[PDB]
């Protein structure tokens, strides 16, 4: 193989492969894209019980990386004029008109600043009807727009509004509009029967196979499944949006604009944004308990960093998804697994690889 193939294989073997034994992870896919060249490394098993090895067709759960597709869908709708980020949700979900949540705008929902939405819905909110009742009954707490609290309900409501503005269900927004515009072939909200043999099982801490059961309004927060080649195409689109037709190009660019700052992290749509180079500590700090689990006051931005990079983790207690890209270096990395790996390990391994790859 090419010298670049061998160099990148060695770096991934050195930095990602040891995580498999350390965390007893059945399967992993790691990809690098550099200058429109893709490098794919597959390890282990998609299904332990079937002894099916991970391969280029293996579909993994993206978990919280799904929010990047919700963000792209929102950027797409905004740039088609179907929504404005200054709108409020009751303009689209009419049952929310004349309720307190209709005082929060769509950008605030997308970027977690409503001031009273936690990581998850309350346990008793289990059905679509109950989600609507929850939002009708909601009242504000913190000054709207001033505090970031990472929140699945918040971006879930944003995704629902995006779908309503496009006159189709959220799963169809992604599967019929967004995924095709990004050139993705095996990315799904609902995996079809003809692809179930490619759909990796997840594994809990007892190494038992588990298959996600959907939660209400879950798809925009954590409901996307994809392959390594598709995720490398997605990173390519984020690195080279100018090469794509206007509607999706504008959508991608919309997700790259920082909207406010918390310490050294800038919150874009879905993506977290940093000045490049970001120190390893800066990247780790973005994943701290303080940032992920607690409210943090935001600061308006005067201007975005001059040179930028972006990342997004899955949940640290779910599996092992992580994506990162650096526009100036025309490079990005994707990691997918079917077993929990701490987010700090994902960030550290990707940092080592991207810092070592030759130009």
Numbering used by the authors: 3 to 361
Sentences from the paper on this structure:
The Ω-loop in monomer A of both enzymes adopts a β-hairpin-like conformation; however, the B8–B9 loop shows a large variation in conformation. In ADC-1, this loop bends outward from the active site, whereas in ADC-1TM, it folds markedly more inward. In monomer B of both structures, the B8–B9 loops adopt a similar conformation (different from that in monomer A) but are ~1.4 Å apart. This difference in location is a result of the Phe322Ser substitution in ADC-1TM, where the smaller serine side chain leads to rearrangement of the main chain of Arg321, whose side chain now projects in the opposite direction and forms hydrogen bonds with Asn204 and Gln207 of the Ω-loop. The proximity of the B8–B9 loop and the Ω-loop to the catalytic serine (Ser64) and the active site suggests that any conformational variations of these loops may affect substrate binding and/or catalysis.
